[PDB]
Amino acid sequence: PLPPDITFDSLALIKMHSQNMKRILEVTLAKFTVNLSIVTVYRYLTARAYLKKNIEAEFEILKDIYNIVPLLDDIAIKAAQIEANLIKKEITLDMEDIITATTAIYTNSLLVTDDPKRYEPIRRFGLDTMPLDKFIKEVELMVE
Amino acid sequence: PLPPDITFDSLALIKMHSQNMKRILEVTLAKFTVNLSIVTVYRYLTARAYLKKNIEAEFEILKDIYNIVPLLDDIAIKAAQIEANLIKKEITLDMEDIITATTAIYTNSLLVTDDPKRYEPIRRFGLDTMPLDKFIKEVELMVEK
Structure with a gap:
């Protein structure tokens, strides 16, 4: 039920790249088009830096x-x-x-x-939104 | 003393585009290269919106x-x-x-x-900064020549 185009805010992106979310990220990148604002990328990068x-x-x-x-x-x-x-x-x-x-x-x-x-x-x-906990669950439900 | 390249933040830019500052702006644009962050532009445009x-x-x-x-x-x-x-x-x-x-x-x-x-x-x-009132004075003196 998820549309092909999604994005994340900075805190969500930080969680998506945490080691405990590897598998959700791989599936997300394999199945969606992800459009990040440069501003989101900036803020994620401040957390990385x-x-x-x-x-x-x-x-x-x-x-x-x-x-x-x-x-x-x-x-x-x-x-x-x-x-x-x-x-x-x-x-x-x-x-x-x-x-x-x-x-x-x-x-x-x-x-x-x-x-x-x-x-x-x-x-x-x-603007349409979805909680990250719900996104994750839907990605988990993509299982055979 | 002002270098060749100048920028403004959004409230400076707002004041710079006031009618009573027209002459300061024209000389500024004429004698310097003004480099505006898209951020600054966006802030200005929100005030106009x-x-x-x-x-x-x-x-x-x-x-x-x-x-x-x-x-x-x-x-x-x-x-x-x-x-x-x-x-x-x-x-x-x-x-x-x-x-x-x-x-x-x-x-x-x-x-x-x-x-x-x-x-x-x-x-x-x-970064080097300059107060807006000091900038205006520098440009004023250039205007009067």
Whole structure:
């Protein structure tokens, strides 16, 4: 029941690359198109650079296995419109969340996340989400 | 003294595009290379979106006059290395400020800003900042000649 195009936020991506999720990641990469915002990639890389002196090799691997979507002009434009609208409704969200969410709408990617409630105000603009625990379970259910 | 390459953060850029600053801006664009992070552009456009302006046209206007620097690979990598270094010293910094500063280091732009203090932990990596009021004075004197 999962659509072909998905994405992750930074915390979800960090969990997806943890050693205990190897098998879910392999299946995910074998069966979905994964479109990561450069901003998500940036934040994941800050978590990686906390441990390692070299993160460049890491980035090259991500660029191969994922579609890394830049902060395109259309995304900058659409993010500005969404963020303006939310602020008027007394809701002001972090840059990372707006760009992640707007990039997901732009690529028609389902946003797999540990905290889907944080993006609930953006669903009005076409964003679809799924909890990571539920994504994982659905990947586990892909079993013969 | 201003170097050849300059950049603004979003609130500086907002003030720079005010009517009463038109002459400062024209000389700035004429005598310097201004290099804007896509982050900065995005922040500016959010303010324009809030005022119900034509955002496609406002982005075109900006691209027609500034060199807009994307979130390049090297910027992403360097920014991350910077942020991790800083977080390890218990320095929490905002993504946009990290990208804006890192983009300035990458293009060797002087970062002109209202709030130089918030980028002060990044100066160790090569960033140079200037207060906006001092920038305006430098450009004023060039105008009067």
